[PDB]
Design a protein around this ligand. Structure first.
Ligand SMILES: CC(C)(NC(=O)Nc1ccc(Cl)cc1)c1cccc(C(=N)NO)c1
Ligand SMILES: CC(C)(NC(=O)Nc1ccc(Cl)cc1)c1cccc(C(=N)NO)c1
Ligand SMILES: CC(C)(NC(=O)Nc1ccc(Cl)cc1)c1cccc(C(=N)NO)c1
Ligand SMILES: CC(C)(NC(=O)Nc1ccc(Cl)cc1)c1cccc(C(=N)NO)c1
Ligand SMILES: O=c1[nH]cnc2c1ncn2[C@@H]1O[C@H](COP(=O)(O)O)[C@@H](O)[C@H]1O
Ligand SMILES: O=c1[nH]cnc2c1ncn2[C@@H]1O[C@H](COP(=O)(O)O)[C@@H](O)[C@H]1O
Ligand SMILES: O=c1[nH]cnc2c1ncn2[C@@H]1O[C@H](COP(=O)(O)O)[C@@H](O)[C@H]1O
Ligand SMILES: O=c1[nH]cnc2c1ncn2[C@@H]1O[C@H](COP(=O)(O)O)[C@@H](O)[C@H]1O
Ligand SMILES: [K+]
Ligand SMILES: [K+]
Ligand SMILES: [Mg+2]
Lengths: 345, 347, 347, 347
């Protein structure tokens, strides 16, 4: 019968597209970066640190919150260690704080402890958010804690946005495969290029009043611009934050150069089922505050180019063009022996 | 006249596409990997070791069958030598076994011997399966041994699926050019990118009740998933298995590292054990025992079937939707902007 | 509502396209390269040196004018210093000179000084040309100096051409993100591949009788040919001229080879003299401007010969592009040859 | 007006495409490679060596003729020397011989000399063949020698095929910018990807009974199959033949590896014997012509087996191309193999 594999379309990631400049009466230092992570939760800047054991513990979540973003404490620890980490962030001046929850046996026990520590939002994320286990997990949590803010992921299709919204999620996280340390697309063959994924999911989210998060695959400040212009309410990153002194792990020096170890939570190292992540070393980047300053400067630039004083205006006025490989070469610095370090390239 | 060359379409290979997640009720450890290699032969996993002199002999084929797959013992040996390798596998517990056959004038005598040795399926293996020799060779074999199971190949179009099924083949092997050791596309200009060829051939084979094998160019566990979602009943690999301890060939040490020889059957070297070569010779990293390699493959497939909500291989096919990515989406899919230090065992 | 992000089309850069040869009655030595930079300023060759502190000061602007083109004195210096740079050009004969102007608190003060120093054209130069500040800046400058020739940039859309034209610009400069040293596309995600931007803008400009400049991203002479065939009246280059002796800066030697420093005006170092939108580095030292210009002019004249165009307007009216793939791109540059002699116009 | 630049289409080169296998009744040892270079000149194999001073003088033309092809003696030498080169080939047993002619003030004198030496075919060779000079030159030549076989080029559009045919060309040479040593597309921005060029032009040639030659950009035997399947009567190669002992220039050796010099006729080096339109470098020494021809022919015969073509006309009338991505390209070459043994037809 007609039941058979189909090739549906071409899907794009951030490097495939550029934003067209609009006429503008706004300069970069006049724009506002506030966003609604959920209906109840507002962020001053639309950035989140990933809930990985190499990216976000309390030290990182504290620095994120004071920069106007938010950090999701990772769940690769005891329930009580994670509640202690959430309690350390909240005791640092009432800062926003998130906590990652997995679909497990102790899932409700973990939620209780991070709820007792007064976590502001829990992220129920799985390899595959469009599942029975996640859907039934969100219903279970919201039945107990109707006011607790719940982000569910990861997903990559508007049907999954709709299904996760019917389950009670207050926000939905987008990204199957784009992770810099992710091999899910290589080992299972599954994933959606992240620009198409975010655009289609945000469009459906907008129909329902449910925001979407662009999770994974972001390398430069410009990628973040594209993701918010595609419709994400916020951008979540591991690689971009994992080289920072505030992320867990010590700054190791090898051959006179400083490194931090960054790894996927599906890697063999994090899990000490077939691995879906790798483990490696990135260059130490310094303090989170200097990275955030370049990221925020890049976003304010992009909105100035597009004439958008708010993130809503950026979405409603974003037009992409697709570029080829040859346009990719043109869009990056070329035919130049770059010497001096650039703080955002 | 209108008789002139044409550009028909764009054709895709595995790295061109990704599978879209589906709403899923089933977890990876719940799924069934069982498949029908032919109407009469079931495999416990849909994996097959290629019929090459650097991949499959009796040690490789025994290990494959023990893991739920099957090995096709190669023909680069005398007839009695190939019959004895088959019977070495069949005397190891009745394990399933295969043997490749060529379009030759000693063809029936080679078939005679492997069948007496209780082979389970022969593979009529030609550079060009959609040809008069293969079609007529399948008929002769089926007329002398109507029960014997015949895979025919290699081919790349639906018309070839149809002509080989009319000729009596129980299964057709798809793949012209994709092999890691293959220069057919470079020296003859001829091939079909493997994902489009599998999709097109599987669609015809399902109208006829004839399975198709995806042979060649598989590099990663996820590629197998795409080849199965595209409609193949099984995947056949050389490169993925050729480093394993149970492949023929001595371990070779170069500058303190371990490698095994891996070479195309159309390479100058394989042909000595006259036509221009259509393969290369080289060394491949030693991959340990076969078991370690199949484990990762199997886990990667199961992972893919959870992502698509598929408890059968059939269900995976009826619900598989592919999305095309660019070279930049390819760069996003693989790990990027990290200096990998520890070894990832399925990457 | 319908208010959301859209993907409009695919846009192309110079390396995506090739010009198709036309039937031709003219050989390269017969074509004319004269161009109208504005309806008041004629250039003998359609080439400009960018307004960067590593490309154009008095010395480069003098050499460019003498070759038939023009230089734009940069503005990373005091007002009196830039006016003094302009006057030295104007005092070296009847020589054309340009000067760049920012949207600054002292904009009119800087315009007054270069006008008093007899500048021929000013370039109102910003990262984002389609902007209130540039539009009102053009209107003020043209209200005070109605005869002064004003170029306004940088922009990348027909709507920007039209709004700059109605604000009074005599010419608009096209290029958002294609510069060799630019990171605008990486840092802001914003840009338009330069071939599509030049074609779209030049078509709009031609309806108004306002010309456009192709600024940035030009690496080879053939790139300039495609920029002019797409409708630009002139081509602006930083990288191509920044290795020349006439550019500012000393020659540097590293590991036995000659270089010059080259850096974007939005780089950290340029602004030392807001997050950066350019990088800083070194390019090969190319020798004197005269030999580089000879190569560029020769390549342009050869392009017009292939296209049967004795004038630049004829080039535009007869230009036809095909899109090439990645594989075509490798066909177009020398391939499968270990190049051993330096050619004056390649690598 | 509507007179403006246009983007006509996407155009393909050989690596963009693969040929689809056809049902075949013919094996590679059963096909025939005979071809008509013009109405009067038959070739036993469809191969020509390029008219360059690193590829073809009398030594190369003698060896090509003996192999069944033809060599085009270059014109970067005096009129008398080129006649004697042609004469040396004709007195080696009446072997087939061509000679190159340019659009020069002495072109009829050059034609006179090589005709007296009994050349079989003239190549009016010029950077841009779709030009008054070449149209008028072919008219002058055919008026004085109505029976002299005349090839003219180089061109890249069906319009050019028509215009040269009306002028009396017996065969047309297709290729603008695809040569291994060509920089025309880089310095002038002008060219057409070679597969599209040959397909369009051959189709136009077939309406006229005028054949086309695929000149340039061929790297493997498989590329020749695509060029003939696209409708070229013959393939012309520089790079593939410049490494042989029979090409002019000595066999050098550096660090144990032997090599020859190879350069464009538009390179600085060749012209000292307008800005350059080629590069100069070195390629691997390949040995004697006979060993290279054998591989090329085996590859072509293999391709025709795959496509079921007993003849080149059959190949053309049954050729169906599929377009492949960048990722299809990597699947098509060998991949993930450390090649240890050099193959006669792949490196
Ligand atoms: C455990 C492991 C290695 N794999 C899976 O759990 N696979 C998987 C799960 C459910 C289904 Cl239905 C299909 C596949 C993992 C661990 C941590 C994170 C991920 C990950 N891919 N995040 O995005 C994966
Ligand atoms: C012998 C050789 C080098 N080539 C051919 O037999 N060519 C070939 C055969 C028939 C036709 Cl009609 C066209 C071409 C070979 C040997 C072993 C395997 C292969 C191979 N490509 N298998 O997939 C090829
Ligand atoms: C200062 C800096 C770094 N950036 C901006 O001014 N950004 C910017 C300005 C306005 C708007 Cl609305 C959006 C972004 C700069 C300096 C010199 C040249 C450039 C450059 N990209 N020219 O083309 C940029
Ligand atoms: C001399 C030189 C460098 N260039 C030209 O003569 N250019 C050229 C001639 C006429 C026209 Cl209308 C347009 C361009 C050359 C010499 C030898 C071969 C070639 C070459 N590209 N052959 O294919 C070119
Ligand atoms: O092991 C893994 N496999 C797949 N995805 C992962 C894994 N670990 C983290 N991720 C995802 O990748 C994101 C980080 O991606 P990055 O910003 O590109 O480095 C995280 O927020 C997770 O969503
Ligand atoms: O010499 C050859 N030329 C072309 N194809 C070959 C040759 N040898 C083996 N093959 C095919 O390529 C496959 C090996 O695939 P691999 O897994 O990509 O290494 C085998 O299953 C054969 O179908
Ligand atoms: O810092 C920068 N950021 C972005 N664009 C720049 C910057 N500096 C110069 N440009 C542009 O790049 C052009 C030079 O480009 P190039 O010829 O490709 O090197 C200049 O004329 C400017 O239009
Ligand atoms: O200097 C040059 N510029 C451009 N094309 C050239 C030049 N010299 C030779 N050619 C062409 O390139 C062809 C050789 O192509 P190849 O086989 O790819 O090396 C010759 O047949 C000529 O048509
Ligand atoms: K750039
Ligand atoms: K070339
Ligand atoms: Mg510190």
């Amino acid at each position: 019968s007609n039941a058979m594999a189909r090739i549906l379309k071409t899907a794009y990631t951030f490097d495939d597209v550029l934003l067209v400049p609009n006429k503008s009466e706004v300069l970069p230092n006049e724009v506002s970066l506030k966003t609604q992570l959920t209906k109840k939760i507002q962020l001053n800047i639309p950035l989140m640190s990933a809930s990985m054991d190499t990216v976000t513990e309390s030290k990182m979540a504290i620095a994120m919150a004071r920069e106007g973003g938010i950090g999701i404490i990772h769940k690769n620890m005891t329930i009580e260690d994670q509640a202690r980490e959430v309690d350390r962030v909240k005791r640092s001046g009432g800062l926003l704080c998130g906590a990652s929850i997995g679909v497990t046996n102790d899932m409700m026990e973990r939620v209780d402890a991070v709820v007792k520590a007064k976590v502001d939002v829990i992220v129920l994320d799985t390899a595959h958010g469009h599942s029975k286990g996640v859907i039934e997990g969100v219903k279970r949590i919201k039945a107990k804690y109707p006011e607790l803010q719940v982000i569910a992921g990861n997903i990559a299709t508007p049907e999954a946005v709709r299904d996760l919204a019917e389950a009670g999620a207050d926000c939905v996280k987008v990204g199957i495969g784009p992770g810099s340390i992710c091999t899910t697309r290589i080992v299972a063959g599954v994933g959606v290029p992240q620009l198409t994924a975010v655009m289609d999911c945000a469009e459906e989210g907008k129909k329902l009043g449910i925001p979407v998060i662009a999770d994974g695959g972001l390398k430069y400040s410009g990628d973040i611009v594209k993701a918010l212009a595609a419709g994400a309410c916020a951008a979540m990153m591991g690689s971009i934050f994992a080289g920072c002194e505030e992320a867990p792990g010590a700054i190791e020096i090898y051959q006179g150069r400083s490194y931090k170890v960054y790894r996927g939570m599906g890697s063999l190292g994090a899990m000490a089922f077939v691995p879906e992540g790798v483990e490696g070393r990135i260059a130490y980047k310094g303090h989170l505050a200097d990275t955030i300053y370049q990221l925020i400067g890049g976003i304010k630039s992009g909105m100035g180019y597009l004439g958008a004083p708010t993130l809503e205006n950026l979405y409603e006025n974003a037009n992409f063009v697709v570029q080829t490989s040859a346009g990719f070469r043109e869009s990056h610095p070329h035919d130049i022996n770059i010497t001096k370090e650039a703080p955002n390239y």
